Design an enzyme around this catalytic site. Structure first.
Site, PDB file in Angstrom:
ATOM      1  N   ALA E  12       0.825  -1.203   0.000  1.00 32.20           N
ATOM      2  CA  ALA E  12       0.000   0.000   0.000  1.00 32.20           C
ATOM      3  C   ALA E  12       0.860   1.255   0.000  1.00 32.20           C
ATOM      4  CB  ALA E  12      -0.942  -0.007   1.204  1.00 32.20           C
ATOM      5  N   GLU E  62       9.402  -7.763  -0.032  1.00 31.43           N
ATOM      6  CA  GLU E  62       9.325  -8.647  -1.183  1.00 31.43           C
ATOM      7  C   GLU E  62       9.568  -7.803  -2.421  1.00 31.43           C
ATOM      8  OE1 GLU E  62       6.983  -9.575  -3.745  1.00 31.43           O
ATOM      9  OE2 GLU E  62       5.375  -8.098  -3.506  1.00 31.43           O
ATOM     10  N   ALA E  90       6.292 -10.951   4.875  1.00 28.53           N
ATOM     11  CA  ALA E  90       5.914 -11.312   6.233  1.00 28.53           C
ATOM     12  C   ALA E  90       4.753 -12.291   6.293  1.00 28.53           C
ATOM     13  CB  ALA E  90       5.564 -10.055   7.032  1.00 28.53           C
ATOM     14  N   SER E 131      -0.279   0.124   5.874  1.00 30.85           N
ATOM     15  CA  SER E 131      -1.559  -0.566   5.817  1.00 30.85           C
ATOM     16  C   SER E 131      -1.614  -1.468   7.040  1.00 30.85           C
ATOM     17  CB  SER E 131      -1.710  -1.370   4.525  1.00 30.85           C
ATOM     18  OG  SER E 131      -0.635  -2.279   4.362  1.00 30.85           O
ATOM     19  N   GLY E 134      -1.609  -5.530   6.801  1.00 30.94           N
ATOM     20  CA  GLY E 134      -0.472  -6.251   6.270  1.00 30.94           C
ATOM     21  C   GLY E 134       0.503  -6.674   7.350  1.00 30.94           C
ATOM     22  N   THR E 136       4.239  -6.627   6.948  1.00 30.88           N
ATOM     23  CA  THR E 136       5.332  -5.664   7.027  1.00 30.88           C
ATOM     24  C   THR E 136       4.842  -4.289   7.459  1.00 30.88           C
ATOM     25  OG1 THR E 136       6.498  -6.875   5.287  1.00 30.88           O
ATOM     26  CG2 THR E 136       7.232  -4.634   5.762  1.00 30.88           C
ATOM     27  N   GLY E 137       3.662  -3.879   6.989  1.00 33.39           N
ATOM     28  CA  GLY E 137       3.154  -2.562   7.335  1.00 33.39           C
ATOM     29  C   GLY E 137       2.965  -2.380   8.828  1.00 33.39           C
ATOM     30  N   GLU E 245       2.030  23.715  13.973  1.00 32.69           N
ATOM     31  CA  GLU E 245       0.705  24.270  14.230  1.00 32.69           C
ATOM     32  C   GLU E 245      -0.358  23.186  14.124  1.00 32.69           C
ATOM     33  OE1 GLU E 245       0.176  28.412  12.776  1.00 32.69           O
ATOM     34  OE2 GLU E 245       1.747  27.906  11.328  1.00 32.69           O
TER      35      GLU E 245
HETATM   36  N1  LIG Z   1      -6.174   1.993  -0.271  1.00 27.68           N
HETATM   37  C1  LIG Z   1      -5.272   1.106  -0.678  1.00 27.68           C
HETATM   38  N2  LIG Z   1      -5.016  -0.008   0.090  1.00 27.68           N
HETATM   39  C2  LIG Z   1      -4.098  -0.916  -0.315  1.00 27.68           C
HETATM   40  C3  LIG Z   1      -3.412  -0.732  -1.504  1.00 27.68           C
HETATM   41  N3  LIG Z   1      -2.570  -1.773  -1.662  1.00 27.68           N
HETATM   42  C4  LIG Z   1      -2.707  -2.605  -0.606  1.00 27.68           C
HETATM   43  N4  LIG Z   1      -3.657  -2.092   0.232  1.00 27.68           N
HETATM   44  C5  LIG Z   1      -4.102  -2.680   1.505  1.00 27.68           C
HETATM   45  O1  LIG Z   1      -3.105  -3.559   1.989  1.00 27.68           O
HETATM   46  C6  LIG Z   1      -3.702  -4.703   2.554  1.00 27.68           C
HETATM   47  C7  LIG Z   1      -2.789  -5.917   2.428  1.00 27.68           C
HETATM   48  O2  LIG Z   1      -1.499  -5.667   2.942  1.00 27.68           O
HETATM   49  P1  LIG Z   1      -0.286  -5.348   1.936  1.00 27.68           P
HETATM   50  O3  LIG Z   1      -0.797  -4.565   0.752  1.00 27.68           O
HETATM   51  O4  LIG Z   1       0.360  -6.624   1.468  1.00 27.68           O
HETATM   52  O5  LIG Z   1       0.771  -4.471   2.772  1.00 27.68           O
HETATM   53  P2  LIG Z   1       2.055  -5.098   3.522  1.00 27.68           P
HETATM   54  O6  LIG Z   1       2.339  -4.372   4.813  1.00 27.68           O
HETATM   55  O7  LIG Z   1       3.245  -4.990   2.601  1.00 27.68           O
HETATM   56  O8  LIG Z   1       1.770  -6.660   3.782  1.00 27.68           O
HETATM   57  P3  LIG Z   1       2.799  -7.789   3.272  1.00 27.68           P
HETATM   58  O9  LIG Z   1       2.764  -7.852   1.768  1.00 27.68           O
HETATM   59  O10 LIG Z   1       2.416  -9.128   3.850  1.00 27.68           O
HETATM   60  O11 LIG Z   1       4.194  -7.446   3.721  1.00 27.68           O
HETATM   61  C8  LIG Z   1      -5.007  -4.887   1.800  1.00 27.68           C
HETATM   62  O12 LIG Z   1      -6.023  -5.337   2.663  1.00 27.68           O
HETATM   63  C9  LIG Z   1      -5.356  -3.509   1.286  1.00 27.68           C
HETATM   64  O13 LIG Z   1      -6.429  -2.995   2.034  1.00 27.68           O
HETATM   65  C10 LIG Z   1      -3.664   0.387  -2.281  1.00 27.68           C
HETATM   66  O14 LIG Z   1      -3.062   0.563  -3.339  1.00 27.68           O
HETATM   67  N5  LIG Z   1      -4.597   1.305  -1.862  1.00 27.68           N
HETATM   68 MG   LIG Z   2       4.781  -6.234   2.195  1.00 26.80          MG
END
Ligand SMILES: Nc1nc2c(ncn2[C@@H]2O[C@H](COP(=O)(O)OP(=O)(O)OP(=O)(O)O)[C@@H](O)[C@H]2O)c(=O)[nH]1
Ligand SMILES: [Mg+2]
Ligand SMILES: Nc1nc2c(ncn2[C@@H]2O[C@H](COP(=O)(O)OP(=O)(O)O)[C@@H](O)[C@H]2O)c(=O)[nH]1
Lengths: 51, 427, 56, 102, 430
Positions: E12, E62, E90, E131, E134, E136-137, E245
């Site tokens: 994300a 990744e 992850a 995100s 996820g 890693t997020g 601010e």
């Molecule tokens: N709004 C929005 N949400 C996103 C987008 N891409 C991924 N997501 C959110 O990300 C969630 C899944 O996690 P990841 O996209 O894989 O993020 P991550 O932290 O890298 O997780 P890992 O790949 O396992 O490492 C989904 O449920 C989406 O809601 C995007 O382009 N826009």
């Molecule tokens: Mg990831």
């Protein structure tokens, strides 16, 4: 220093937190003495100025 | 760079695997002699997952073929893709299969074990990284069930972290090719429960039934029956090979779909499937795909989910498509049939999207789910095994190999407990 | 019925709760270092003085 | 977490002894929860006065007690194996000589 | 001069990176190669000649998502060392991305952010994108913020994260990672923004006219909000708003910082010609629940503070009249212990359009960021969902095996309950 010391304690990194506490108390003593001098310098002047 | 090593065991695994390599070689555009002649730069992004590179632009698959008799192997050589495989990866014995689980496990399996393992070590330690291994075998046979489980244990001891995903074929309840199946299936289940991370079960009866219902094939041979299985295998690894809007590889699938270490047996299904004459009259869209996937008739395993309940389910989508439309369907199919999902786990349905569809198809989807409906499958084999075990003399074929009779009681006990365990979670 | 209650303990057939695969996946913490890594023979390990004259 | 006073008295006395470092096996297994929870309060008290050195020492005691307890649990597991298999083996040991007798 | 550093985590975060940096480059006018056919130095560095480089770091575990940038059109603009990619993801596991794989790469990223900080004479804050669902997020993002807290201290660490949708979900383990990540965020984050995908889908279809969106269209909506947020630092205006601010005026308490976001006008390029869109009209549109980017109804709760940012031919007199009127209504409730409740920022640069975009060439727009007690509605849903799954211990084996001790599960649960108590205690009146 005390903001970074907070996070060191909160992250459970206690060995490094000891070092900053050592420097924090050291940095207080230098600064505490100065404002004591400035206040005493100003306090001495005002009574001379008023007299 | 998430390399996967492919293992094919037995008469069933070799014939499934051979067709499987035709699909990916077409997907990545690899000529049967091994040279790339493709049409897009995307196909060379991450082809290292399945192929190795030799001097001169030749790609060799990361495959090992295993059998006890040479008859199956010579069929692979005569195939159009026979020259593709590395000759040293052909490992065979010089004895009959015997169609016996104990003989394959103990007598001939031990001799082939060290020879096969070192071949795997060559492939396992030849790449920068290794996500997991892949095994294809049948459970009614003697080599795939006997020797396949033996190799599965040794793989776990040496590489505990890697994902040991297996594709298995379960003996049919009405008509099947072999008499001694109840012994082979029960004894192998002991080894599969504790060792493999993921097990996918496929029954030949559904493949016949799906072909007669949907594809309208009057006389489908094993070529078209194997083709349905190869699509499922291709779909699961598609997130590794191609980019997408939301990536989900094997280890993501294991985390979401496996709530408890022993409950990991899965059912599979593929959509869209349409009669090759009726394709013009069908407006294939996102809602139409989910209609097939959650339809019980598209399950490749003859275990009607409606008689059980779902625990977790996952869907893979391929092709340029709306993320809103995919997510909205997953809402509705969970909401419209709330009688078929467990209340103590919300959001039971997983989703993922990949950019690049298979050839000829503008969009397609794959289903993997875990449900209590597996109890029907294990009840049939256990009841038949119980009938067979009291007639003790068929055990004599297994005693003459070194198998202790207590292993039968041990095998049935763990199988019986798994049936109870899949039942206990229904509360 | 008391025998029935004793038979079905409150675990309720959560069998094999730690499987062989999960035991493979779990991360094992670092062990103590090997003896060879520590090795230095006695008399040199016991030395007390040095050749640098940091005194006055 | 409002541990009772009776547990607190017994645990803190051992907590005081453990903080001296001498005891290695003086841990009561049923009372190990009270000792660790008592160390939590002493950890909180140490942090409030800037005694982060003692806080880490309490952390070291927490892992020391837990790790050694696992070894006491490890000996229990192996004692189960030898005892259970020996009885099972005796069934086969008796049958061997009786097979010759028959 | 005055500067911010952008940090992106996960799929994300990186995909949002393309959405935002496409807007920054187009709005500033720099070509994808770094040439020209000003505020430039807030977001870009000059290397001599005429070459510019973004002041950002992309992180994931990744390589697939990052290599799309490395092979994409914008590949030359970014500098190779900024794009950091791990080996294996992850797998939607917090413990995996926090202890095992996170710590494999955490120290490499900390050099690149600090080295990027050397070129910062007037650094005033960071921006971090997550995100929550996820691996890693949440796992690596938590480990990153904990280190940056001690590395830099009293520097504003703003976040802009995607809260889980109220019903829409893509991962079953989503409640586990969201709660565990929250504990790491609250103590260390200066302020963290939430948006959710489910509201954006409804907004991208109703107000903006698209039958079926993708994640690309959603990313551009977020890109507009971030661009308005930083416009005060970059361009002249009657009322600028610095980061500092923003921090003081919005948060009433240490742990209550969580705001919600809204943007107006959002209207298709076809229908946008049909309305004059005065300051009063666009201001009224923000306050409706339908325009909220977080699917929680403000009427269920109360408002704690508000901030409005205007980008266009917007005059100070007519701003005061509109904010005065919305105060007169009795559908927007305020805690009576907050009589003022507003900070207004005004900037002259109008919103910028994007080729292949979904929005119009609007001459005035307004962005809104307010803290509400209605967000306690969202926390209750997540708390209840986690309770059902943890009661039967549905997924604990995966997380414990990857280094996490089980005691963290009740600690994270207890800490969320305290946050829920704080929001209810704030809602109390005297
Ligand atoms: N709004 C929005 N949400 C996103 C987008 N891409 C991924 N997501 C959110 O990300 C969630 C899944 O996690 P990841 O996209 O894989 O993020 P991550 O932290 O890298 O997780 P890992 O790949 O396992 O490492 C989904 O449920 C989406 O809601 C995007 O382009 N826009
Ligand atoms: Mg990831
Ligand atoms: N799906 C499928 N099944 C096959 C194929 N060839 C054989 N089988 C089935 O696989 C089952 C077991 O085969 P078997 O020869 O015992 O394999 P083994 O594991 O090496 O002993 C038989 O019931 C066959 O009907 C094939 O090409 N496709």
């Amino acid at each position: 220093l005390r903001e970074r010391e907070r996070h060191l304690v909160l992250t459970k990194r206690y060995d490094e937190a000891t070092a900053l506490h050592k420097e924090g108390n050291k940095m207080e003593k230098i600064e505490e003495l100065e404002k004591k001098r400035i206040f005493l310098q100003t306090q001495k002047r005002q009574r001379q100025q008023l007299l | 760079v998430r390399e996967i090593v492919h293992i094919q065991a037995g008469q069933c695994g070799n014939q499934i695997g051979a067709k499987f390599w035709e699909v990916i070689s077409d997907e990545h555009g690899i000529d049967p002699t091994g040279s790339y002649h493709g049409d897009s730069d995307l196909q060379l992004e991450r082809i290292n997952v399945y192929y190795n590179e030799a001097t001169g632009g030749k790609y060799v698959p990361r495959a090992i073929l295993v059998d006890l008799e040479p008859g199956t192997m010579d069929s692979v050589r005569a195939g159009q893709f026979g020259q593709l495989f590395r000759p040293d990866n052909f490992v065979f014995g010089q004895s009959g299969a015997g169609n016996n689980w104990a003989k394959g496990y103990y007598t001939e399996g031990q001799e082939l074990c060290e020879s096969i393992l070192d071949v795997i070590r060559k492939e396992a330690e030849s790449c920068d990284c290794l996500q997991g291994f892949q095994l294809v075998h049948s459970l009614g046979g003697g080599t795939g069930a006997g020797l396949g489980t033996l190799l599965l244990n040794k793989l776990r001891e040496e590489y505990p972290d890697r994902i040991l995903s297996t594709y298995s074929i379960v003996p049919s309840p009405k008509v099947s090719d072999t008499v001694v199946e109840p012994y082979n299936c029960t004894l192998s289940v002991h080894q599969l429960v504790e060792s493999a991370d993921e097990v996918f079960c496929i029954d030949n009866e559904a493949l016949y039934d799906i072909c007669f219902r949907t594809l309208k094939l009057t006389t489908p041979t094993y070529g078209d029956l194997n083709h349905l299985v190869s699509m499922v295998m291709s779909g699961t690894t598609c997130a590794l090979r191609f980019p997408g809007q939301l990536n989900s590889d094997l280890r993501k699938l294991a985390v979401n779909l496996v709530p408890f270490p022993r409950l990991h047996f899965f059912i599979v299904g593929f959509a869209p499937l349409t009669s090759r004459g009726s394709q013009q009259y069908r407006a294939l869209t996102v809602p139409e795909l989910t209609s097939q996937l959650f339809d019980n008739k598209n399950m490749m395993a003859a275990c009607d989910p409606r008689r059980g309940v779902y625990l977790t389910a996952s869907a893979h989508f391929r092709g340029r498509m709306s993320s809103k439309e995919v997510d909205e369907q997953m809402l509705n199919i969970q909401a419209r049939n709330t009688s078929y999902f467990v209340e103590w786990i919300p959001s039971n349905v997983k989703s993922a999207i990949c950019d690049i569809p298979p050839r000829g198809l503008k969009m397609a989807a794959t289903f993997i789910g875990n449900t209590t409906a597996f109890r029907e499958l294990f009840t049939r084999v256990d009841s038949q095994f119980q009938k067979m075990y009291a007639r003790r003399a068929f055990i004599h074929w297994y005693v003459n190999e070194g198998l202790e009779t207590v292993e039968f009681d041990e095998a049935r006990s763990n199988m019986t407990d798994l049936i109870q365990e899949y039942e206990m979670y229904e509360t | 019925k008391a025998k029935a209650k004793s038979a079905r303990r409150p675990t309720f057939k959560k069998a094999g709760r730690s499987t062989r695969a999960s035991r493979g996946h779990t991360v094992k913490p670092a062990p103590p270092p090997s003896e060879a890594e520590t090795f230095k023979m006695k008399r040199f390990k016991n030395i007390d003085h040095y050749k640098i004259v940091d005194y006055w | 977490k409002t541990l009772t006073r009776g547990e607190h008295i017994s645990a803190e006395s051992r907590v005081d002894d453990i903080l001296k470092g001498a005891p290695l096996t003086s841990i009561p297994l049923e009372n190990v929860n009270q000792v660790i929870i008592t160390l939590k309060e002493r950890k909180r008290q140490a942090t409030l006065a800037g005694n982060y050195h003692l806080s880490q020492q309490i952390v070291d005691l927490i892992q020391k007690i837990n790790s050694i307890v696992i070894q006491r649990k490890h000996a229990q597991m192996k004692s189960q194996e030898i005892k259970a298999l020996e009885i099972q083996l005796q069934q086969a040991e008796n049958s061997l000589k009786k097979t010759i007798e028959q | 001069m005055r500067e911010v550093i952008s940090i992106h985590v996960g799929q994300a975060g990186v995909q949002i990176g393309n959405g935002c940096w496409e807007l920054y480059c187009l709005e500033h006018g720099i070509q994808p190669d770094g040439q020209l056919p000003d505020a430039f130095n807030t977001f870009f560095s000059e290397t001599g000649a005429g070459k510019h480089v973004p002041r950002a770091v992309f992180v994931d575990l990744e390589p697939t998502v990052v290599d799309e940038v490395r092979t994409g059109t914008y590949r030359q603009l970014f500098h190779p060392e900024q794009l950091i990619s791990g080996k294996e993801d992850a797998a939607n596991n917090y413990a995996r991305g926090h202890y095992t794989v996170g710590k494999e790469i955490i120290d490499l990223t900390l050099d690149r952010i600090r080295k990027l900080a050397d070129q910062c004479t007037g650094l005033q804050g960071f921006l971090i994108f997550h995100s929550f669902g996820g691996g890693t997020g949440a796992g690596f993002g938590s480990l990153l913020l904990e280190r940056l807290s001690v590395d830099y201290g009293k520097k504003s660490k703003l976040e802009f994260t995607v809260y889980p949708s109220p019903q829409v979900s893509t991962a079953i383990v989503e409640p586990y990672n969201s709660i565990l990540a929250t504990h790491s965020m609250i103590d260390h984050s200066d302020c963290a923004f939430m948006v959710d995908n489910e509201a954006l889908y409804d907004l991208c279809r109703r107000a903006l006219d698209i039958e079926r969106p993708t994640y690309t269209n959603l990313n551009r909506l977020i890109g507009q909000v971030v661009s308005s947020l930083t416009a005060s630092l970059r361009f002249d205006g009657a009322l600028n708003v610095d980061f500092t601010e923003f921090q003081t005026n919005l948060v009433p308490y240490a742990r209550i910082h969580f705001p919600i976001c809204s943007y107006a006008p959002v209207i298709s390029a076809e229908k946008a010609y049909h309305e004059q869109l005065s300051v009063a009209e666009i201001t009224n549109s923000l306050f409706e629940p339908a325009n909220m980017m977080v699917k929680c109804d403000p009427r269920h709760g109360k408002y704690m503070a508000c901030t409005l940012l205007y980008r266009g031919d917007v005059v100070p007199k007519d701003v005061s009249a509109a904010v005065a009127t919305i105060k007169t209504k009795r559908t927007i409730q305020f805690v009576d212990w907050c009589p003022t409740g507003f900070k207004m920022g005004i900037n002259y640069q109008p919103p910028t359009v994007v080729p292949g975009g979904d929005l119009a060439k609007v001459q005035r727009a307004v962005c809104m960021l307010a803290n509400t007690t209605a967000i306690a509605e969202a926390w209750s849903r997540l708390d209840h969902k986690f309770d059902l799954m943890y009661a039967k211990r549905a997924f604990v084996h995966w997380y414990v095996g990857e280094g996490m001790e089980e005691a963290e599960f009740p600690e994270a649960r207890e800490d969320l309950a305290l946050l829920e108590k704080d929001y209810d205690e704030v809602a109390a009146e005297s």
